[PDB]
Amino acid sequence: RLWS
Amino acid sequence: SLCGRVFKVGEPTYSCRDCAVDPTCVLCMECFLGSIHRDHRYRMTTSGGGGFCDCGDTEAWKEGPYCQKHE
Ligand SMILES: [Zn+2]
Ligand SMILES: [Zn+2]
Ligand SMILES: [Zn+2]
């Protein structure tokens, strides 16, 4: 998953 | 046998707009171009670093959860  | 890549700074990242379960789901370039999603609508970003490839997470993709390398 994207890091945010 | 699976991907598990952690994105590096500057690395191209892809999401399939058609198949992603949600907008956090993404693939590294190796997995994207080796998957069905290369022929779908996609969103490409340049990674800031961190985060990971979702190839093989059968709950991240409504179709094509793996690429040809990791199937
Ligand atoms: Zn990958
Ligand atoms: Zn893969
Ligand atoms: Zn797709």
Instruction: Return phi, psi of residue B33, to 5°.
Output: -70, -20
Angstrom distance (rounded) from CA B54 to CA B58: 9
Residue in this structure with the two tokens 């093989």, named with its chain if needed: B56
Q: Is B60 left (phi over 0), alpha (psi -120 to 50) or beta?
A: alpha
Which residue, chain included where needed, has tokens 């959860």? B65
Residue partners of B30: CB distance under 8 A and separation at least 6: B3, B5, B67, B69
- Is position B25 annotated in a ligand binding site? no
Cβ–Cβ pairs < 8 A, chains A and B: 19
Does residue B44 belong to the interface with chain A, where contact is any CB pair within 8 Å?
no
For residues B53 and B16, what is the distance between their CA atoms, to the nearest angstrom? 13
Phi and psi at B30, nearest 5°, equal -55, -45
Question: Hey, where are the domains in chain B?
Answer: 3-71
**Structure-determination technique:** X-ray
* Separation of alpha carbons B62 and B50, rounded Å: 24
Resolution in A: 0.8
Radius of gyration in angstroms for the set of CA atoms belonging to chain A, rounded to a whole number: 4
- Going from the Cα of A2 to the center of ligand 3, the distance in angstroms, rounded, reads 17
